[PDB]
Design an enzyme around this catalytic site. Structure first.
Site: not given
Ligand SMILES: CC(C)C[C@H](NC(=O)[C@@H](NC(=O)[C@H](CCONC(=N)N)NC(=O)OCc1ccccc1)C(C)C)[C@@H](O)CC(=O)NCCc1ccccc1
Length: 395
Positions: A37, A238
């Protein structure tokens, strides 16, 4: 000639909706799967005391079994990094954009990162124990989350800065290279050998110091610029966002073209022909590159590239063939090609649109912008790179 450490990623967009990897934690090592992440800063997971967490691939991390684990205590001392102190422990807590609230306590232990070529880097990190999990976390195979963003001056040292601090033989660059199925994380650079053809890397300056934001100036389809606003959109890069998220105004314009490309009744030649004529009236004018639009339609129709819709009207085609490239204009006014094999993902035997409306006014370049590219995080030069690639697959 750069030294590259390579790590296997597993996952996909339809079934996991993230990509994950394994890491060793504690002494002796405990294998733990973590969502990769680049949109958060922590390293965290359930720990054995947990009575309010989800079931995952691995049992919660067992602190009593790690000879090197150390819970961070307080209220007889102060909590460093401006953390809260609840019931004597320094509190871990995280709100995510998706809506999940995860809370618990902090501890440190040894982290061992081992490449699949057996190259080991080892260091202690301050990590979070989940004592409370929520929503999507209650339905998630991966055990925890590995945030990849950067350390703030008086903040918790993050995994990425620690990895490089303890691996000076590497340049401070990590590359994410995801496929439909699994992919690869590279530390130390990118691999030119994965690059399509040989295509050149497109670079952009990051717009904030400790987070991976870039500016997007325009988003074109069939020669029409859909961005109504003047300032470039500041978008989070992201890997922990399954889809790419864009403003409503922007989404509705794109979706109008995608609706027309989505022919749900090819068995109905009369209605198809009506669509064709309706489209010629609406868009055969200088506001659109009509040539390309009709080119796309004819391809879709000739190959019988049937479309179906799923949740919130998302379009799914039988084939990638006929779908147009989208074009992303970045900060330095480079018009970058966004191909259907990226923005569409595999769901069963169809290819579905991986673009959504944003929530909370947060534009996000997600996994459907990563797919079949090397995304290069050049920490040393404050930039992010993009280039089309044949990424590795797992399994
Ligand atoms: C793992 C995930 C929680 C990390 C987080 N990403 C997100 O919150 C995004 N979540 C997603 O895309 C989620 C991630 C996967 O599921 N989440 C999970 N298992 N916990 N995907 C998702 O909702 O798709 C739905 C779905 C679910 C199941 C099957 C198929 C599809 C939001 C933006 C839609 C992170 O990348 C962004 C974040 O919230 N970071 C927190 C710090 C911060 C705050 C504001 C801005 C920037 C950063």
């Amino acid at each position: 000639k750069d030294l590259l450490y390579k790590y296997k990623l597993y996952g996909d967009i339809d079934e996991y909706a993230y990509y994950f990897l394994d890491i060793d934690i504690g002494t002796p090592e405990q294998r733990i799967s973590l969502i990769l992440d680049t949109g958060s800063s922590s390293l965290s997971f359930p720990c054995a005391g947990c009575k309010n967490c989800g079931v995952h691939m691995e049992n919660p991390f067992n602190l009593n079994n790690s000879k090197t684990s150390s819970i961070l205590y307080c209220e007889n001392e102060e909590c460093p990094f401006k953390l809260n102190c609840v019931k004597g422990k320094c509190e871990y807590m995280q709100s995510y954009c998706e809506g999940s609230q995860i809370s618990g306590f902090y501890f440190s232990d040894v982290v061992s990162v081992v490449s699949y070529n057996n190259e080991r880097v080892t260091f202690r990190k301050l990590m979070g124990c989940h004592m409370h999990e929520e929503s999507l976390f209650l339905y998630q195979q991966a055990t925890g989350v590995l945030g990849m963003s950067l350390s703030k001056p008086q903040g918790i040292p993050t995994f990425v800065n620690l990895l490089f601090d303890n691996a000076p033989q590497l340049k401070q660059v990590f590359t994410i290279c995801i496929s439909e199925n699994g992919g690869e994380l590279i530390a130390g650079g990118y691999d030119p050998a994965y690059i399509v053809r040989a295509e050149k890397v497109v670079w952009e300056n990051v717009t904030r110091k400790y987070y991976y934001y870039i500016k997007v100036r325009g988003l074109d389809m069939f020669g029409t610029n859909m961005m109504s606003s003047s300032k470039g959109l500041e978008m989070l890069v992201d890997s922990g966002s399954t889809f790419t998220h864009i403003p409503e105004d922007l989404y509705n314009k794109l979706n109008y073209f995608f609706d027309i490309l989505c022919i749900q009744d090819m068995n109905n030649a009369y209605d198809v022909n009506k669509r064709l004529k309706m489209t010629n009236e609406s868009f055969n004018n200088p506001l659109v590159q009509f040539d390309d639009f009709r080119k796309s339609l004819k391809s879709i129709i000739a190959k019988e590239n049937m479309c179906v819709k799923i949740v919130d009207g998302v379009q799914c085609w039988k084939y990638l063939e006929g779908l147009p490239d989208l074009f992303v204009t970045l900060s330095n006014n480079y018009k970058m090609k966004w191909q259907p094999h990226s923005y569409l993902y595999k769901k069963e035997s169809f290819w579905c649109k991986g673009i959504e409306k944003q929530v909370n006014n947060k534009p996000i370049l997600g996994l459907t912008f990563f797919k079949n590219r090397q995304v290069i995080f050049d920490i040393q030069k404050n930039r992010i790179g993009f280039v089309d690639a044949n990424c590795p697959s797992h399994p």
